[PDB]
């Protein structure tokens, strides 16, 4: 029966129920005859310890791919690995909503997006200069002075050929 460990991804074998994941404390009440939980997709979610009637979650270990945010060799040579949708605990490091980002420092300033990352984060090599990762600002934040009786009709124009 050995020992039980929380918040660390590990195999588990509960009364013949095998699998992999990380066990976390949960506040889901179980009926005395109900042993293990379930989700909508017929996927195990909560398991109770047979020794102590404590309700424990089951969570994916990390999943996520390994993205590589790099500028072109025309400009630079440095990398910035994004580990998609993982907490920055198992894996300088600036945690994002989209995942655990490595090699770029968060920038408190917001600029135009150049290399989209995920969940609003964008990277760039320019400011020495190094790869960054900030919260994207779509264009300069404008506030047109909406008026009771005033207009801004153009006096000149341009004729582009896209």
């Amino acid at each position: 029966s050995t020992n039980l460990v929380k918040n660390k991804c590990v195999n588990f074998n509960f009364n013949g129920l095998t699998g992999t994941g990380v066990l976390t404390e949960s506040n889901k009440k179980f009926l005395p005859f109900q042993q293990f939980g379930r989700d909508i997709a017929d996927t195990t979610d909560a398991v109770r310890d047979p020794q102590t009637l404590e309700i424990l979650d089951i969570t994916p270990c990390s999943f996520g791919g390994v993205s590589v945010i790099t500028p072109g060799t025309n400009t630079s040579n440095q990398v910035a690995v994004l580990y998609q949708g993982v907490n920055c605990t198992e894996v300088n490091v600036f945690q994002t909503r989209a995942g655990c980002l490595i090699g770029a420092e968060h920038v408190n300033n917001s600029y135009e997006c150049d290399i989209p990352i995920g969940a609003g984060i964008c990277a760039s090599y320019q400011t020495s200069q190094s790869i960054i990762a900030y919260t994207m600002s779509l264009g300069a934040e404008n506030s047109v002075a909406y008026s009771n009786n005033s207009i801004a009709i153009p006096t000149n124009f341009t004729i582009s050929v896209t």
Binding site: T18, T20, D39, I40, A41, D42, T43, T59, P60, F63, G64, G65, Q84, G85, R97, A98, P116, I117, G118, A119, G120, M136, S137, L138, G139, A140, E141, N142, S143, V144, A145, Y146, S147, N148, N149, S150, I151, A152, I153, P154, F157
Partner: protein
């Protein structure tokens, strides 16, 4: 209230872990198929980027995120229902909140990528588009935005549908009351009638059954001895284990290919609807559409995009 899907769940199934997870025999048997798994990944990543492209083509048609002045002298029109409320931590207006309340994991093999445009950013683009519609009228999509009063916007917006501009300047009070009562009726309908957003629960539903059916394919026998790779490896001698894992790989790869093919067909469908929404914003929000029965039954004045989960609402 026209309801249109724009994007979808940007699922990017990793085929390798979807099928063979901690299984040397499954890995060595899937290596034979080669380009199938890689092509599935490439197609799914193309889908994932293309919902993003749809999202910028729909919402990100505005150069600069505008902000409505706190004073709102609209001449009668009450926009507090759709203009964002600073009180909420996320600046999604009351009706958008109703949308999200109306519409109701990622650990089997099907890790969903978060949208590049998070919900707050989607709401901010919609607020910018609607603020351009009010303040700048329509020129904010056809060059730089141009300050123009809302009542003077009708000086051309009635003229779009062949109704003279004087209708507003002689009937503004009742037109404003009619619009406010109408939008309140949409409020009550979304509060009580669940079929108003039919197309958005449609898209999110068939996405839900797509994901759920795919993940229960993992539980399908497919003609093998079972659907547990670990049990097959533990029990069977390798000569039969390889054959049964081959049955599983054929079945599960066929299931995943079918899933991604239906997803490509549905992605072309959602691309049709997303170009439809882009055209309805450009013609219809960022202008005034002349296409009859395009922005709803009857001659059309303007539209107000209202971000909704995995879609847009006009």
């Amino acid at each position: 209230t026209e309801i249109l899907p724009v994007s979808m769940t940007k699922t990017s199934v990793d085929c390798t872990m979807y099928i063979c997870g901690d299984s040397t025999e499954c890995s060595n048997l899937l290596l034979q198929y080669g380009s199938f798994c890689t092509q599935l990944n490439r197609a799914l990543t193309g889908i994932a980027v293309e919902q993003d492209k749809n999202t910028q083509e729909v919402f990100a048609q505005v150069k600069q995120i505008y902000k409505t002045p706190p004073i709102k002298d609209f001449g009668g029109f009450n926009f507090s229902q759709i203009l964002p409320d600073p009180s909420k931590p996320s600046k999604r207006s009351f009706i958008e909140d109703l949308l999200f309340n109306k519409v109701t994991q990622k650990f089997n093999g099907l890790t969903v990528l978060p949208p590049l445009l998070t919900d707050e950013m989607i709401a901010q683009y919609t607020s910018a588009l609607l603020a351009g519609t009010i303040t700048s009228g329509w020129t904010f999509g056809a060059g730089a935005a141009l300050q123009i009063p809302f009542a003077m916007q009708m000086a051309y917006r009635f003229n779009g549908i062949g109704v003279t501009q004087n209708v507003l300047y002689e009937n503004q009070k009742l037109i404003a009351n009619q619009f406010n009562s109408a939008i309140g009726k949409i409020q009550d309908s979304l509060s009580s009638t669940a079929s108003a957003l039919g197309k958005l629960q449609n898209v999110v539903n068939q996405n839900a059954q797509a994901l759920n059916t795919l993940v229960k394919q993992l539980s399908s026998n497919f003609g093998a001895i079972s659907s547990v790779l670990n049990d097959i490896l533990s029990r069977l001698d390798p000569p039969e284990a390889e054959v049964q894992i081959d049955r599983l790989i054929t079945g599960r790869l066929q299931s995943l290919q079918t899933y991604v093919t239906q997803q490509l067909i549905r992605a072309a469908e959602i691309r049709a609807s997303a170009n439809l929404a882009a055209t309805k914003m450009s013609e219809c929000v960022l202008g005034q559409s002349k296409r009859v029965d395009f922005c709803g039954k009857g001659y059309h004045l303007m539209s107000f995009p209202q971000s909704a989960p995995h879609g847009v609402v006009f």
